[PDB]
């Protein structure tokens with residue numbers, strides 16, 4: 001094993017080197033390249049990765065700085081986040097229409113929310129501010145045209161009606177909107193965010209994407225079947241995102257119903273995704289060559305989000321932190337690949353390095369996930385998410401409401 005994680009100082013060093021290796025994948029700060037994206041999209045034969053994964057990377061580094069105190073990449077990350085906001089400061093740049101799902105937009109909004117929560121340095125005064133960007137994403141996701149009567153509500157996966165998948169009302173789109181609402185409620189103390197989050201969670205429960213008995217979290221269903229054709233694939237990021245949002249709702253509301261939802265979601269996650277203490281992507285990891293580029297990132301979100309759950313729902317700490325520790329140990333045990341002696345693969349539970357080429361990418365998602373898992377070992381030393389009591393960001397009451405906003409020509 002190359003990386004050592006047995007003390008705070010070892011974890012900091014390992015995380016620093018992991019942050020370096022992940023950054024090698026990113027070219028967006030170089031002359032002639034596009035800030036905020038990893039190489040791609042694969043539809044243009046430019047690389048393995050889609051736009052939203054750039055947003056995921058940005059958030060990973062906002063967390064990295066928050067967890068380690070290392071600001072080395074902050075300028076690169078600010079540039080990347082600001083470059084992708086779009087003309088209406090809502091993370092709907094039109095050049096990316098083909099990739100514009102509520103999930104894709106949601107992940108960028110969640111990185112902006114995280115920047116506000118983590119007191120990440122503010123953009124210049126003339127540029128969109130982190131809280132305002134999260135508010136804009138949330139507001140566009142709350143817009144009435146995104147909430148029709150099919151399946152008695154819920155967001156569709158895609159934003160443009162002509163995008164393939166507009167007929168799929170899926171967990172992730174709704175989970176992103178739920179999580180943003182819960183987090184905006186806690187930060188701003190505005191209850192309209194919370195009422196929407198309650199409504200969307202109740203919809204996810206009613207439609208049965210949350211299993212009423214087991215609290216498994218399925219993937220989605222299609223409008224032409226009234227959402228009854230449930231795709232029962234259980235992706236780790238869906239349950240973990242609902243856990244994260246539920247923890248924010250528990251912290252904000254202090255309502256026992258939210259504590260029960262936290263506990264039930266957490267029981268399900270530990271049962272389903274942790275195998276001998278190691279996170280495992282059950283829909284695809286069972287054999288090599290099945291996980292998509294997107295799926296290779298999920299276990300990093302699981303670690304980062306579950307670690308925050310322990311701060312805002314502290315009664316969960318002893319259920320979560322020991323399991324994140326064993327999962328992160330497995331992550332680093334297999335970061336031993338050539339040519340560097342420290343290259344990271346995906347198959348942590350297996351105990352062995354597998355070349356990311358088996359899954360047809362250069363390995364950025366695997367690198368991101370290990371960075372996330374190792375950094376998040378420092379959660380016990382980190383400040384909890386800030387609210388507007390101590391945060392430094394600024395909001396915008398008209399976030400998402402510009403007259404040139406896409407909702408105005410839907």
Ligand SMILES: OC[C@H]1O[C@H](O)[C@@H](O)[C@@H](O)[C@@H]1O
Nearest residue numbers: 170171172219220235294295
């Ligand atoms: O990567 C998994 C992811 O793939 C696609 O985005 C859709 O099928 C989603 O519902 C699913 O969660």
Ligand SMILES: [Ca+2]
Nearest residue numbers: 099100101104
């Ligand atoms: Ca997409």
Ligand SMILES: [Ca+2]
Nearest residue numbers: 047048360361
């Ligand atoms: Ca490829």
